[PDB]
Design a protein around this nucleic acid. Structure first.
Lengths: 435, 54, 100, 63, 65, 103
RNA sequence: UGAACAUUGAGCCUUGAUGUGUAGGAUAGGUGGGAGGCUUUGAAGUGUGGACGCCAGUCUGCAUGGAGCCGACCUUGAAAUACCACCCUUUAAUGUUUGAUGUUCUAA
RNA sequence: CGGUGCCGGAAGGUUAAUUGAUGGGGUUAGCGCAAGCGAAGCUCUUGAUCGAAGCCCCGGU
RNA sequence: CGAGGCACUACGGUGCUG
RNA sequence: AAGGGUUCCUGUCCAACGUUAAUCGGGGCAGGGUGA
RNA sequence: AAGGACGUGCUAAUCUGCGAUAAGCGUCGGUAAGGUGAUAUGAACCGUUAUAACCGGCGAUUU
């Protein structure tokens, strides 16, 4: 804890990135605690406890406590995630958009521009939608002034600016290095409530209570699902075979050495976060317009699938598998490997660069994400199954659990690799010189 | 057929495992500490912020 | 018995390397390395009795090394045999049930 | 080595070697040539253990 | 009538920001991957940045206190 | 017989390396040993891969002779044959270099 | 690597009949013994073959013959004869020995 | 048809190995005072005798 | 099998049809 | 056929070696390929 | 049998050693703190004074 701090402070490039990474997470909850004008936190706070929809609640835990208290970032990262994929699907549908994306850097930059103007259009639709939805029957709002044109107009302006800032803050820190703006926002929001509960439990009891018993069950579950993710992540699919022989001697034999070990064996990091972002995105807004004055049919469809009864589990689970397997197919890698091999003076047979190598990456890519997608659905049923006897825990198990493991495991996969050579270098230095 | 062919090559590619993953689970627990400790920082620094700006 | 345990040792290594052994292993036939045995009868009975595939007649051809132009001597890697063992039922690629 | 060979007998070693030869060295050596998993130490055993058993038989009909 | 006039202005702040990204894409692309280099510093348009964060902490004191 | 082992302390009879001691990390069959901090040369080591093989001219342990280094006993820098006369069920070393007889 | 039978030289002989010069009746190669045969089928006489036919003749095998021997119980010469040894021969049959050929055989 | 070669003939001459007659020599029992003669046995040398094909010769080609 | 045509393709070629 | 024995093809590389240059080759480098 | 042919290691040409029990296997003793023969010591591991390796006597396998 202390050691990792010295190590990342010691190399000056790491220091000043981890400065903004930490602070971003901090500034995320700065905004959430301080109410904004044109909407007041308290009226919103009771109104979301009463619910208009199970739909709304789900939406609230990804996006964080910035939708719970009436504050900027409320819409959150989730319209940008919904936008990026929708643009990528729309590229195939249109003849016109396909050409803009293919043509050079500038075309790919325009697509990327259209998506961020996209994102902001959906934000203004959601702020209109949310603002007028609330005080017209299911609740009432405003102590700054009572409802009216002024009240909704000012309300819109605030959240829109909020979302602009959020999208620019995510983009900023990707560029600089360390952490993604997608993982930053979801992570801040969900985990904020977690340490008081944990902190409470340790103090109260150690051999059991009731409240300890339910948390303790979830503690077995959490470790199981962590095991399974590190189980799928170890494997061997890296093929090593030196090109030619180039006489013998030197080491065990001096051949042109070409090691090609890619992959990791892990899928459903990025895709699982998209798949969930997308399906709640129509749904939540639909709910808002039918609790308020708007659509009653659009909401009904949302209910038909997502959670309410365990009959609806099988409809979210086909959609999860599907949206993940979709997202990966879009992401370019089924043939990346073969183009690289060519570029390097490293050649070989039994896997000769060109078309045959490509066919092998395309095989690899497919079975890999499909199996990572399957694990995701199993993981959900496992709390369901063990809870149908011993009580009904409702701590981190299912959706709650995956977000936390993926984020710490992504971030300290990349970050422990830098960190751990820093540690090694420190220890060997003390030992060789003085220390 | 078609769906059996996806399943009959996937049944031999289901391997991907190790033991000593309890090492990695001890670091999932240290990884958990980092999220508990960053969200406890929020309560600390954002409460100084609740004095001021709240 | 039909044959002993030492007439059930005849496979030490497959052959999968590139064209006509990845192409002619997926779409049709199958291929495996027969070191220096000089038999066909026992390679048919091998992947029956052990493993789980049934095959047609095993087809035999000698390969006169995979040449190395110059080495410590002149190179040259010693003789071996390639055999098309040729499936008729089971239609799997083997390496099922853990290594075989 | 020493005590290993000596604490076996005629009947015992016979039933142990079928396993050694076929699918404790057999599985390994095939796997190994295919890049799946080959560990050099593991080759040194099994191969040199089934071998050890056959010695005793023609030497003294079991140790 | 500060909240009404400055409100229209808050929207203005949204413009200069929505554009900063649109044009600020000579090394950024949604989920792109570009590790910076010798180029960077603090923008030229970061004056917009400071104008933003400052703008909302500003609506803090003005709105309630 | 032998004075070196795998934890031997020397004092060194090699010039520019006298008054210097360390453990004997490993014995070589070339009549060599590796003594600490002295066999270091600046070695022009290729950084092909950069982070998987180190750049620079890195200080790197060679090997010096066993017959131009000299044991330190436990009080004296004396070296002139060590006794194996004593048996504890296997040969044991002691000094006859000074005749102090500390094993 | 041999046998009978047949011929035919040559080697020892064994057993019978002469060994003729001149002179000597004739049968003297030489040497020695020597008046000797007196029997009655037996020489001789009467006849034969051979010896000489050179001087009457006898000799010597055999038929007749029981007829009592003969170098002439001469004598010439260097030696005298019968008869016995025997030089040696002329000559014949046996025992053979050997070398040639011939003939027939089988058993090498 | 002399010569030379081949074919044929033997009347006679010439003629090996082989068989070894005779002559000469050495030794000594014995006799001899010497000199010399020396049986028997054993030996050295000499060769009478018989010796074919071949040659000579007589024809033909 | 097939003169020749219908598709897409990296422009190497493959399928469809006769 | 004989004989050669991989010289065939593929990815690659040009210092020497093809009467020259040489990106190319049967040259350097190693694999892939001969199925009754 | 002498002598070969062809293999054989962790893998890879050849050398060294050895034979499908194949750079070894057993058995009795010596010996040992470092090692797994070489070009090329790498990858993996083993020993550490009493548990690697090497040496010698006997045996085994010896296509």
């Amino acid at each position: 804890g202390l050691d990792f701090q010295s190590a990342k402070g010691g190399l000056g490039e790491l220091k000043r990135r981890l400065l903004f990474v930490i602070g971003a997470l901090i500034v995320f909850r700065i905004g959430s605690f301080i109410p904004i004008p044109g909407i007041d936190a308290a009226v919103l706070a009771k109104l979301l406890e009463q619910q208009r929809g199970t739909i709304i609640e789900m939406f609230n835990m990804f996006s964080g406590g910035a939708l719970s208290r009436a504050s900027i970032f409320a819409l959150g990262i989730m319209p940008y995630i919904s936008a990026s994929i929708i643009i990528q699907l729309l590229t195939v549908v249109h003849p016109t958009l396909a050409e803009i994306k293919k043509e050079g850097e500038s075309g790919r930059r325009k697509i990327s521009q259209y998506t961020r103007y996209g994102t902001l259009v959906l934000a203004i639709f959601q702020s209109i939608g949310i603002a007028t939805g609330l005080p017209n029957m299911p609740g009432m709002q405003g102590l700054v002034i009572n409802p009216g044109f002024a009240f909704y107009f000012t309300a819109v302006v605030s959240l829109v600016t909020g979302t602009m800032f959020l999208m620019w803050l995510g983009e900023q820190i990707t560029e600089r290095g360390i952490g993604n703006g997608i993982s930053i926002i979801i992570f801040a929001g969900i985990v904020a409530g977690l340490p008081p509960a944990i902190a409470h439990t340790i103090e109260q009891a150690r051999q059991g209570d009731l409240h300890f018993l339910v948390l303790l069950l979830v503690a077995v579950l959490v470790f199981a699902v962590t095991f399974f993710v590190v189980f799928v992540e170890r494997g061997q699919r890296r093929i090593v075979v030196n090109y030619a022989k180039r006489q013998q001697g030197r080491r065990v034999y001096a051949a042109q050495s070409t090691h090609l070990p890619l992959k990791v064996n892990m899928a459903g990091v990025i895709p699982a976060i998209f798949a969930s972002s997308i399906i709640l995105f129509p749904a939540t807004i639909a709910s808002w317009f039918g609790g308020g004055t708007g659509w009653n049919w659009l909401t009904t469809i949302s209910l038909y699938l997502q959670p309410g009864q365990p009959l609806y589990v099988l409809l979210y689970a086909s959609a999860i598998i599907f949206f993940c397997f979709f997202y990966t197919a879009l992401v370019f890698n089924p043939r990346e490997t073969a183009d690289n091999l060519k570029k390097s003076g490293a050649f070989v047979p039994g896997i000769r660069p060109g078309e045959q190598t490509a066919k092998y990456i395309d095989k690899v890519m497919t079975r890999l994400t499909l199996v990572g997608a399957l694990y995701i659905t199993f993981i959900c049923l496992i709390p369901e199954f063990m809870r149908d006897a011993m009580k009904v825990p409702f701590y981190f198990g299912g959706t709650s659990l995956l977000i936390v493991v993926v984020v710490i495991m992504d971030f300290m996969a990349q970050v422990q690799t830098l960190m751990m050579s820093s540690q090694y270098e420190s220890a060997l230095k003390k030992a060789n010189l003085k220390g | 057929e078609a769906r059996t062919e996806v399943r009959k090559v996937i049944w031999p590619t289901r391997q991907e495992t190790l033991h000593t993953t309890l090492i990695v689970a001890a670091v999932t627990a240290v990884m958990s500490l980092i999220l508990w400790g960053l969200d406890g920082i929020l309560v600390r620094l954002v409460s100084f912020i609740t004095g001021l700006r709240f | 018995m039909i044959r002993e345990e030492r007439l059930l040792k005849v496979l030490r290594a497959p052959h999968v390397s590139e064209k006509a052994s990845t192409a002619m292993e997926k779409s049709n036939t199958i291929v495996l390395k027969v070191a220096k045995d000089a038999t066909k009868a026992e390679i048919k009975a091998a992947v029956q009795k052990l493993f789980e595939v049934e095959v047609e007649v095993v087809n035999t051809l000698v390969v006169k090394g995979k040449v190395k132009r110059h080495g410590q001597r002149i190179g040259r890697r010693s003789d071996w045999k390639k055999a098309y063992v040729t499936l008729k039922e089971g239609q799997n690629l083997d390496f099922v049930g853990g290594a075989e | 080595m020493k005590a290993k060979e000596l604490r076996e007998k005629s009947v015992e070693e016979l039933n142990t070697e079928l396993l050694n030869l076929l699918r404790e060295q057999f599985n390994l050596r095939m796997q190994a040539a295919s890049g799946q998993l080959q560990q050099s130490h593991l080759l040194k055993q099994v191969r040199r253990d089934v071998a050890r058993v056959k010695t005793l038989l023609n030497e003294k009909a079991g140790a | 009538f500060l909240i009404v006039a400055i409100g229209l202005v808050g929207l203005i702040m949204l413009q200069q920001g929505k554009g900063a990204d649109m044009g600020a894409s000579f090394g950024a692309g949604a989920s792109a991957t570009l590790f910076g280099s010798s180029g960077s510093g603090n923008f030229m348009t970061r004056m917009t940045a400071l104008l933003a964060t400052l703008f909302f902490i500003i609506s803090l004191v003005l709105g309630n206190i | 017989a032998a004075k070196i082992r795998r934890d031997d302390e020397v004092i060194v009879l090699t010039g520019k390396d006298k008054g210097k001691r360390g453990k004997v990390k490993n014995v070589l069959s070339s009549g060599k040993v590796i003594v600490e901090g002295i066999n270091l040369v600046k070695k022009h080591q290729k950084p092909v891969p950069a982070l998987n093989q180190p750049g620079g001219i890195v200080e790197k342990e060679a090997a010096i002779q066993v017959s131009n280094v000299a044991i330190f006993n436990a009080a004296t820098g004396k070296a002139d044959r060590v006794g194996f006369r004593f048996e504890d069920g296997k040969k044991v070393r002691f000094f006859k270099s000074n005749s102090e007889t500390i094993k």
